[PDB]
RNA sequence: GGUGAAAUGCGAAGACCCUGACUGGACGAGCGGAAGCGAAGGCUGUGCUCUUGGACUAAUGUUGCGAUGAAGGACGAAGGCUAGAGGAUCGAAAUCGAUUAGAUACCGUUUUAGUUCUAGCAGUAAACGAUGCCGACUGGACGGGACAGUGUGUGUUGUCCAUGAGAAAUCUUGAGUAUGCGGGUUCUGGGGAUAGUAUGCUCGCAAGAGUGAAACUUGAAGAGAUUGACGGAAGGACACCACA
C-alpha cells in the first residue's frame, strides 16, 4: 500500500464457463474452458466470437517429439454450451527457433501466398541453414550469393504445388507431418547441403470458413 | 598503443553504428564488445520442486540465447574486460566451430 | 528422520567463510547428494536431515 | 516516504499542543521485514551523513538488507501549519512566543519526518506542552498511563481524555 | 482439472503477477508487488515478489484454478530485455502453494528494426 | 513510471496490465566476420528493370596512341540555409524539480527548431594508415576471397618470425635495396609565439570558405624512451592494533 489510506478516489460467481473444442483431425479435441461476463439478460454472445487461443501440438496429438510447434485457433460459433474453433495460424516456440541460427553459417529464407479451396488466403514463411560435410576443416560454411537466389526459387515452387487450391482439412495434415520441409531438403541439397528446413510460421490474411 | 587502432575494420571506409545496451551511446559495430550466453529459463535451485509439480510425464526445461553489446566505458566499468599488460594484450580467444559436441 | 554420512569435503564457500560445502551419502537408500552445512564438520560424520531433495550445486 | 505525528482524544478547554522535537521510536527495515530490536532516539540537533554525503539526523546500517538507513526531521513551514501566536506577561511588551498547529480533523499536527530505507511503526513517549483556551501555558504536562492529562489555572480544568500518539503516512 | 495462464512481467522495477483465462481475455486475479511495500526503491525486489505471489495463491486457489501455464517476459523493445530479480521467486512461491505446472515459454518483445532510444551520442553520464 | 535516493508531472471522466480491430511515420535486428564492392564521401529485407567495375582465360584487332601534372572542371559525412510536402521516435534553445557553499551544468519533468522525402545552394572534418603517383629488384611460416587448372598459376588481401632500416616506439610489396649518396615527375616545411589574426581580392542568400602579412615580443617550445613519486586506478596475498 504505497499511498496513504484515502487520498485518491460477488460478480465472479455470476459468470459462465464454456468449453473450447478444436477441429476433429487431432485426437484430443477438448482444450479448456473460457469465462463470459453476462452483460445482459439474453446476452448476445457475439462478444465471445473473435477470441483466439493456441495449443501445443504435443497435446492435440499425444506425442513428445513434436512439441516444438503450435496451432492457433479462432472462435467462430457457439453450440449450446460449447465453442468451436477454426484454423488460424501456426508457429514455432521461441526457444526452438533461436537454436537453429549458427555463427559462421548462412541462413536462407523465403515467403509466399497461397489460396485454399473456399477462398481463404494464407501467407507462409520458410527457413533453412547450410550444412558441413563429414570432413570439414575450414572455419566458415557460406554459400555464394547467386546460389541463394537459386535455392529461393525452389522454395517458391515447393510451397505452391503442395499448399495450393486444396481443402483446409488437409493443409493442417501436411503442416503437422513436415511435408514441405522435407521436399526443400532434397531438391535444394543438389545445389548445396542444407539442414533444419521447416515451415516457420503461417498467417491468415483473409478467411471465409 | 594497438595495431588495430582499437577496432576490427579493414579496407572499408564506414561500417555502421549501434546504440549501447546500458547507457545508449552511439558506437561503431566493429568496435563494440559483444558477448553471447545461453541461460536456462528456470533457476537451478528450483528443479526439485518442479519435478513434482509437472503434469506431463516427460519435461524439458527451455534455454534461450542472448547477444549483448556495450561501449568501452561500460564494459571497462562493469569489469567485462580488464586492463592487461603490454605482451598479454595480443592474445585472442575464439570458439572453434568444428568441435565435436 | 533421515540421516547420511559425509564422505567428501568439497570446500568452504560462505559469505565470510561460514558455511562449508559437502557431499553426503544417504543411508536408507544409497544416493550421493550435495549439501551445505554450518558447523565444524569432519569426514566420517553422520548428519541428520528432515527432507532429502536438494543438491545446491 | 513522509510521516506525520498526531495527538488524539477528546479535548476540554484546550487551544494548542506542541512537542519539543526529541523522542524515541521503533523502526524496521524495508526490503527485509526484520525490525530493529531497540528504540532509537531521533533528536533535531544530531548530525550524520548518508551514502551521498548529505546531512541527516540519524544513520543505521540495516543488518540483513546490508545498506544504510536515514531519518531526519522537517520543521512545519510557518505559512500554513503553525500560525504564530503570543501570550501574556508583565506590563511592558514581553509577550511570550509560541507556535500552535490547527485542529483539522479532531487532532493536532506536531511533527513531520522524512525517511530513506527505514520505516517507523510506533512512537513511545514525548514531552507534552499544553496551552489554555485563554492565555496560560502548562509545560511538561505529566500525562497519565491512563491517558488523561489535567491541569488547573487556579480555578478551571484544562484536560485531555483518550490521549495517544500516532504515526500516519503522508 | 481447470487451467489458467500466468503472465509474469519482471523488470528492474515492479514485478507483475496477472492470471487470466485460456483465451487471455478474462482476468481472475492481478496483484503487483509494489502494492505490498511502502518504499519506491523496493517495488521490484525478491521479498516483495513473494508477498505478491502469496495473495494471488490463496485467492485463485479458492476460485477453482488448479493448473498454470506460464508466459514470462522482460521489457523488450528498445528497453533491456532479460528477466529481473523478482521473477524466479514468484514462480517458486506458487509451485509450493499446491498448483501444478504445464508449459513454459518466454514471450519478450523483439525489435527487428527498432526506433531510437534515450541518451544521445554520448549516453547517460552518471 | 523512473532514480544513488526522490521530487515536480500522469491515474476512479478506470490509468498500468491482458485481449479483438485499425491508422501513421521511421527503421531493416539475429545471421554479421580483422569477409566483399565503390574514385573517395559511402553501401546489408524480397522480386523485376535500366546502368557499372576489376580479375581471370585465349594463335582476336590495332601498333607506342604513354608517365607526371600550376591553370581549368565534376563529385564530396554531419550540422546549417531556400522552397514545397510530412510528422512515429529522439531532442539543441526555453522551462520547472532536485543536487550544491553556488551551479545559467551532469540527473529528471513539460515542451520546440531540427531528425524524413523531393528540388537546389554551400564546400568543411582526428574527410586518418595522421603514410604523393608511376617503374625495377628482393627470405620463410599459417591463412582468406575470385577465376583458371589439376597436385600448380595470376591479380588482391589478414596475422606471425628473420635479414635490413630507424632517434626510438616500431616497419615486412616497405618506414628495405649503404654519406657505398643521381630510375621519371610534382607538392609542402625552414625555432616558438603574434596568427590562420589584419588588409586587398575572388566566391556565397547568409553562416562563411579560398588565398594570406607585419610591428611588437621571447630561450626554448617539441618527439620517443628510462628510473622514481603520485592515482576519488585494477589485481594477488595476508593480519583478533580486520572481519566471521
Ligand atoms: Zn554504454
What count of Cα atoms within 13 Å lies in the side-chain half-sphere of residue D78?
4
Instruction: Tell me E40's DSSP state.
Output: G
Contact call for residues A4 and A22 (beta carbons, < 8 A)? no
**Considering only CB atoms, which chain A residues are within 8 Å of B55?**
none
Say how far apart CA A19 and CA A24 lie, in whole Å.
Answer: 15
Contact call for residues E23 and A50 (beta carbons, < 8 A)? no
For strand E67-73 and strand E100-101, is the pairing parallel, antiparallel, or unpaired? Answer: parallel
SS (H, E, C) chain D: CEEEEEEEEEEECCCEECCCCEEEEEEECCCCCCECCCCEEEECCCCCCCCCCCCCCEEEEECCCCEEEEEEEECCCCCCCCCCEECCCCCCCCCCEECCCCCCCCCEEEEEEEEECCCEEEECCCCCEEECCCCCEEECCCCCCCCEEEEECCCCEEEEEEEEEEEEEC
Q: Is B59 exposed, middle or buried (0-12, 13-18, 19+ CB in 10 A)?
A: middle
Experimental structure resolution, Å = 2.7
Contact call for residues D153 and D12 (beta carbons, < 8 A)? no
The kind and range of the H/E element at E96 are helix E88-97
Contact call for residues B38 and B50 (beta carbons, < 8 A)? no
D77 C-beta less than 7 Å away from strand F: no
Contact call for residues D70 and D117 (beta carbons, < 8 A)? yes
- Cell numbers for D102, please give them: 490547527
Centre of ligand 1 to C-alpha E96, Å, is 40
Residue–nucleotide distance: D47 CA to F30 C1' (Å): 55
Q: In what order do the strands lie in the sheet with E3-9?
A: E27-32, E16-20, E3-9, E67-73, E100-101
**Interchain CB contact of A2 with E (< 8 Å):** yes
Contact criterion met (CB < 8 Å) for B48 and C56: no
E33 C-beta less than 7 Å away from strand F: no
- Cell numbers for D46, please give them: 544530531
Say how far apart CA D78 and CA C42 lie, in whole Å.
Answer: 69
Say how far apart CA A47 and CA A44 lie, in whole Å.
Answer: 7
Say how far apart CA E10 and CA E17 lie, in whole Å.
Answer: 9
Instruction: Tell me C21's DSSP state.
Output: E
Residues 6+ apart with CB under 8 A from E12: E44, E80, E84, E85
Say how far apart CA E9 and CA E2 lie, in whole Å.
Answer: 23
B82 C-beta less than 7 Å away from strand F: yes
**Interchain CB contact of D169 with A (< 8 Å):** yes
Q: Which residue has the cell 551511446?
A: B25
For D115, name the nearest residue in chain E, comparing CA atoms only.
E39
Angle at which helices E88-97 and E46-60 cross, to 10°:
30
Q: Describe chain C by its helix, strand, coil percentages, rounded to 5.
A: 0, 40, 60
Task: Give the number of other CB atoms < 10 A from CB of residue D109.
Answer: 19
Q: Which nucleotide is nearest to B86 (CA to C1')?
A: F169
For strand E3-9 and strand E67-73, is the pairing parallel, antiparallel, or unpaired? Answer: parallel
Contact call for residues D17 and D108 (beta carbons, < 8 A)? yes
Q: Which residue has the cell 559495430?
A: B29
Q: Which residue has the cell 564506414?
A: B14
Say how far apart CA A138 and CA A190 lie, in whole Å.
Answer: 21
Q: Which residue has the cell 572455419?
A: A139
- Cell numbers for A140, please give them: 566458415
Residue burial E75-108, b: 16+ Cβ < 10 Å; e: rest? bbeeeebbbbebbbbbbbbbbeeebebbbbbbbb
Among D114, D110, D126, smallest CA distance to D39 is for D126
Say how far apart CA A128 and CA A105 lie, in whole Å.
Answer: 11
Residues with CB under 5 A from ligand 1 (ion): B 20, 22-23, 71, 74
**Interchain CB contact of D31 with E (< 8 Å):** yes
Say how far apart CA E71 and CA A199 lie, in whole Å.
Answer: 24
Say how far apart CA D17 and CA D137 lie, in whole Å.
Answer: 10
DSSP of chain A, one letter per residue? --S-SSS---TTTTEEEEEEE--TTSS--EEEEEEEE--STT--GGGSSS-EEEEEHHHHTT-STTTTEEEEEEEEEE-SS-EEEEEEEEEE-HHHHHTT--TTB-EEEEEEEEE-SSS-EEEEEEEEEE---TT--SS-B---HHHHHHHHHHHHHHHHHHSSSS-HHHHHHHTTTTSHHHHHHHHSTTTS-EEEEEEEEEEEEE---
Say how far apart CA E41 and CA E20 lie, in whole Å.
Answer: 28
C17 C-beta less than 7 Å away from strand F: yes
Distance from the Cα of E100 to chain B's closest Cα (Å) equals 5
**Considering only CB atoms, which chain B residues are within 8 Å of A98?**
64-65
SS (H, E, C) chain B: CCCCCCCCCCCCCCCCEEECCCCCCEEECCCCEEEEEEEECCCHHHHHHHHHHECCCCCCCCEEEEEEEECHHHHHHCCCCCCCCCCHHHCCCCCCCCCCC
A51 C-beta less than 7 Å away from strand F: yes
Say how far apart CA A68 and CA A142 lie, in whole Å.
Answer: 27
Q: How far apart are the first and last CA of chain C?
A: 23
Given A98, A99, A104, which is nearest B97 (Cβ)? A104
Centre of ligand 1 to C-alpha B71, Å, is 5
For B47, name the nearest residue in chain C, comparing CA atoms only.
C54
- Cell numbers for D161, please give them: 481524555
Angle at which helices A180-187 and A145-162 cross, to 10°:
140
Contact call for residues E104 and B55 (beta carbons, < 8 A)? no
Say how far apart CA E56 and CA D88 lie, in whole Å.
Answer: 62
Q: What's CA E116's distance to the chain center, in Å?
A: 26
For strand A83-92 and strand A69-78, is the pairing parallel, antiparallel, or unpaired? Answer: antiparallel
Among D46, D57, D27, D23, smallest CA distance to D128 is for D23
Say how far apart CA A119 and CA A204 lie, in whole Å.
Answer: 12
Q: Which residue has the cell 548462412?
A: A106
Amino acid at each position: 500500500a504505497i499511498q496513504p489510506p484515502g487520498s485518491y478516489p460477488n460478480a465472479f460467481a455470476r459468470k459462465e464457463w464454456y468449453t473450447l473444442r478444436s477441429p476433429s483431425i487431432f485426437p484430443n479435441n477438448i482444450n479448456g474452458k473460457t469465462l463470459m461476463t453476462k452483460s445482459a439478460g439474453k446476452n448476445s454472445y457475439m462478444n465471445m466470437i473473435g477470441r483466439r487461443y493456441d495449443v501445443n501440438q504435443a497435446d492435440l496429438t499425444g506425442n513428445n517429439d513434436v512439441g516444438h510447434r503450435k496451432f492457433i485457433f479462432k472462435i467462430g460459433d457457439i453450440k449450446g454450451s460449447e465453442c468451436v474453433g477454426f484454423f488460424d495460424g501456426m508457429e514455432l516456440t521461441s526457444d526452438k527457433h533461436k537454436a537453429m541460427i549458427k555463427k559462421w553459417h548462412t541462413l536462407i529464407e523465403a515467403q509466399k501466398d497461397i489460396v485454399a479451396k473456399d477462398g481463404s488466403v494464407f501467407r507462409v514463411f520458410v527457413m533453412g541453414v547450410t550444412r558441413r560435410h563429414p570432413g570439414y576443416v575450414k572455419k566458415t560454411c557460406y554459400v555464394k550469393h547467386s546460389d541463394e537466389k537459386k535455392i529461393r526459387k525452389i522454395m517458391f515452387d515447393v510451397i505452391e504445388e503442395e499448399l495450393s487450391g486444396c481443402d483446409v482439412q488437409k493443409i493442417m495434415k501436411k503442416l503437422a507431418n513436415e511435408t514441405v520441409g522435407k521436399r526443400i531438403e532434397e531438391l535444394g541439397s543438389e545445389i548445396f547441403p542444407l539442414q533444419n528446413c521447416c515451415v516457420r510460421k503461417v498467417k491468415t490474411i483473409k478467411s471465409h470458413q | 598503443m594497438r595495431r588495430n587502432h582499437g577496432r576490427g575494420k579493414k579496407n572499408r571506409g564506414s561500417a555502421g553504428s549501434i546504440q549501447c545496451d546500458k547507457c545508449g551511446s552511439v558506437t561503431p559495430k566493429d568496435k563494440a564488445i559483444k558477448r553471447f550466453r545461453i541461460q536456462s529459463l528456470i533457476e537451478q535451485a528450483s528443479f526439485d520442486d518442479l519435478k513434482q509439480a509437472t503434469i506431463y510425464d516427460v519435461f524439458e526445461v527451455p534455454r534461450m540465447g542472448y547477444k549483448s553489446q556495450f561501449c568501452v566505458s561500460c564494459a571497462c566499468h562493469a569489469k567485462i574486460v580488464r586492463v592487461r599488460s603490454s605482451q598479454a594484450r595480443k592474445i585472442r580467444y575464439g570458439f572453434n566451430p568444428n568441435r565435436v559436441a | 528422520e533421515f540421516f547420511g554420512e559425509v564422505t567428501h569435503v568439497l570446500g568452504r564457500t560462505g559469505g565470510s567463510g561460514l558455511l562449508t560445502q559437502v557431499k553426503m551419502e544417504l543411508m536408507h537408500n544409497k544416493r550421493t547428494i550435495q549439501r551445505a552445512v554450518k558447523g565444524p564438520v569432519a569426514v566420517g560424520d553422520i548428519i541428520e536431515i528432515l527432507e532429502c531433495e536438494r543438491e545446491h550445486r | 516516504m513522509h510521516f506525520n505525528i498526531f495527538v488524539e482524544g477528546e479535548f476540554n478547554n484546550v487551544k494548542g499542543v506542541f512537542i519539543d522535537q526529541s523522542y524515541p521510536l521503533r523502526i524496521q527495515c524495508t526490503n527485509c521485514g526484520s525490525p530493529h530490536e531497540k528504540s532509537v532516539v531521533l533528536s533535531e540537533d544530531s548530525v550524520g551523513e548518508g551514502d551521498f554525503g548529505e546531512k541527516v539526523n540519524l544513520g543505521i546500517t540495516c543488518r540483513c538488507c546490508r545498506r544504510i538507513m536515514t531519518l531526519k526531521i522537517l520543521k512545519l513551514k510557518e505559512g500554513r501549519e503553525v500560525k504564530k501566536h503570543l501570550l501574556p506577561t508583565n506590563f511592558e511588551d514581553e509577550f511570550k512566543e509560541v507556535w500552535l498547529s490547527d485542529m483539522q480533523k479532531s487532532r493536532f499536527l506536531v511533527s513531520r519526518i522524512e525517511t530513506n530505507g527505514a520505516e517507523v511503526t510506533s512512537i513511545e513517549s514525548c514531552i507534552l506542552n499544553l496551552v489554555s483556551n485563554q492565555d496560560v501555558l502548562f509545560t511538561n504536562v505529566n500525562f497519565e498511563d491512563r491517558t488523561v492529562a489535567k491541569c488547573n489555572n487556579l480555578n478551571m480544568i484544562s484536560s485531555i481524555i483518550d490521549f495517544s500518539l500516532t504515526v500516519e503516512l503522508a | 482439472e481447470l487451467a489458467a495462464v500466468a503472465h509474469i512481467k519482471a523488470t528492474k522495477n515492479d514485478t507483475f503477477v496477472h492470471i487470466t483465462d485460456m483465451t487471455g481475455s478474462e482476468t481472475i486475479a492481478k496483484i503487483t508487488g509494489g502494492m505490498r511495500v511502502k518504499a519506491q526503491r523496493d517495488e521490484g525486489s525478491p521479498y516483495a515478489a513473494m508477498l505478491a505471489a502469496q495473495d494471488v495463491a490463496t485467492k485463485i486457489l479458492g476460485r477453482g484454478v488448479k493448473v498454470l501455464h506460464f508466459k514470462l517476459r522482460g521489457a523488450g523493445g528498445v528497453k533491456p530485455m532479460a528477466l529481473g530479480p523478482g521473477a524466479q521467486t514468484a514462480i517458486r512461491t506458487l509451485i509450493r502453494a499446491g498448483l501444478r505446472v504445464g508449459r513454459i515459454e518466454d514471450v519478450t518483445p523483439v525489435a527487428r528494426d527498432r526506433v531510437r532510444k534515450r541518451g544521445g551520442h554520448r549516453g547517460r553520464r552518471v
